Amino acid sequence: WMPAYACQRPTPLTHHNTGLSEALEILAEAAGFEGSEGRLLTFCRAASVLKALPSPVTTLSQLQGLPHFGEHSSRVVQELLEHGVCEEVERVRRSERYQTMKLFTQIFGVGVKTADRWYREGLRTLDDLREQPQKLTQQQKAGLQHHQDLSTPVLRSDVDALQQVVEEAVGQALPGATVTLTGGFRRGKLQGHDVDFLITHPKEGQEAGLLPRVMCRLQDQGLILYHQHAFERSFCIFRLPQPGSWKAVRVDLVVAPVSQFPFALLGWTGSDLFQRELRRFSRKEKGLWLNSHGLFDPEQKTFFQAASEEDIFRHLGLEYLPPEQRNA
DNA sequence: CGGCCTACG
DNA sequence: CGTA
DNA sequence: GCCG
Ligand SMILES: Nc1nc2c([nH]c(=O)n2[C@H]2C[C@H](O)[C@@H](COP(=O)(O)OP(=O)(O)OP(=O)(O)O)O2)c(=O)[nH]1
Ligand SMILES: [Ca+2]
Ligand SMILES: [Ca+2]
Ligand SMILES: [Ca+2]
Ligand SMILES: [Cl-]
Ligand code: NA
């Protein structure tokens, strides 16, 4: 009754099993820190199944038949239901390894492989990194410089102000170009770690070269603290004005041709797990290859022409889910 | 047993 | 590798 | 870790 892929079922933002899902997500995160993407995926999928249930799980029995629940995930839920705590989860939480890998991977520009190397070298704190700036890329230096602000959740007021300044720069760069808010905010979240914008133009090809012109206009207005610079994606840090001051905010900008807009909108709206599951479903169940540019039939060697996200869902044989039900 | 999303910067 |  |  519970479909196996997250893209086959609605997942609302508010759900009924946060305690259980948070515990499984700890184990998922720790599996990633140890280099097991497969165990990460299973524990994420099991946590996501719980977010899709209509009611709180109160008894072991209620897991029977659910996909992605086997002996390990079931034992974790068992222990939480019976004792309010799972020893394995608590051991991970309080481990030096987990706490330090979380601290380091939370830096913009630092992933698991980098964090693990630094951990093996004996580094433990952000101060330790700042004292060895030779080990840092320019992206990491920016992430570390602005780490305090980047740890502060971005709210909706920040989004609306950011969208106004992005729209102004986009309109100055190319008349008729548009800006669409994507990411978690489009799914209905009230906070995020960054703001995501998708930029296009209704006339195919007019958007070529647009992102450098936007970035230059934002940089000239003093709004850019960091960006990597032809390009179509920018993972930036913006100097966002605040009353009497400013704060650093992570902003992602993507430019796509309008032919690709539905695919880019779907991909960048997420969630991360929802999109990996949708791409897996497409390839493994339907034989079609999905990305943020298109949906390819490798036997006909043709791309599906979609005018909306709904068209993509329909072509994949899936019930349509609005963004606020993609919170897998 | 092997697979596990995707590709741009 | 990073985005993640 | 779970599944095809
Ligand atoms: N984080 C992440 N996002 C991914 C991945 N693959 C993929 O297509 N995306 C898409 C879906 C996300 O909604 C979109 C933007 O990334 P994001 O981390 O800002 O996601 P979010 O807005 O839901 O998160 P947040 O700001 O609320 O923390 O990128 C991936 O592996 N990780
Ligand atoms: Ca990081
Ligand atoms: Ca975001
Ligand atoms: Ca983002
Ligand atoms: Cl694994
Ligand atoms: Na099972």
Numbering used by the authors: 137 to 365, 384 to 397, 410 to 494
What do the paper's sentences say?
DNA polymerase μ incorporates nucleotides in the non-homologous end-joining (NHEJ) pathway of double-strand break (DSB) repair. Error-prone synthesis by pol μ often introduces mismatches, as well as short deletions or insertions, at repaired sites. Pol μ is expected to frequently encounter oxidized nucleotides in its biological roles. We employed time-lapse X-ray crystallography to obtain snapshots of 8-oxodGTP insertion by pol μ on a model DSB substrate.
To explain these observations, we solved the structure of the pre-catalytic Ca2+:8-oxodGTP:Ct ground state ternary complex of the Lys438Asp variant. Surprisingly, 8-oxodGTP adopted the syn-conformation and formed Hoogsteen-like hydrogen bonds with Ct(anti). The primer terminus had rotated ~180° relative to wild type, while still stacking with the 8-oxodG(syn) base. O3′ of the rotated primer terminus was now stabilized by Ca2+ (instead of Na+) bound to the HhH motif through a water molecule. The loss of steric restraints due to removal of the primer terminus prompted Trp434 to rotate into the major groove. Apart from Lys438, active site interactions remained similar to wild type. Primer terminal instability appears to be hindered by Lys438, as the primer terminus is more readily displaced in the ground state 8-oxodGTP(syn):Ct(anti) ternary complex of the Lys438Asp variant. Lys438 provides steric constraints for the incoming nucleotide and primer terminus, as substitution of this residue with aspartate results in 8-oxodG(syn) and primer terminal displacement. Although 8-oxodGTP is accommodated in the active site in the syn-conformation opposite Ct in the absence of Lys438, efficient 8-oxodGTP:Ct insertion appears to require 8-oxodG to base-pair using the Watson–Crick edge. The role of Trp434 in active site stabilization is additionally revealed in the Lys438Asp mutant, where this residue contributed to modulation of catalysis by destabilizing the primer terminus.
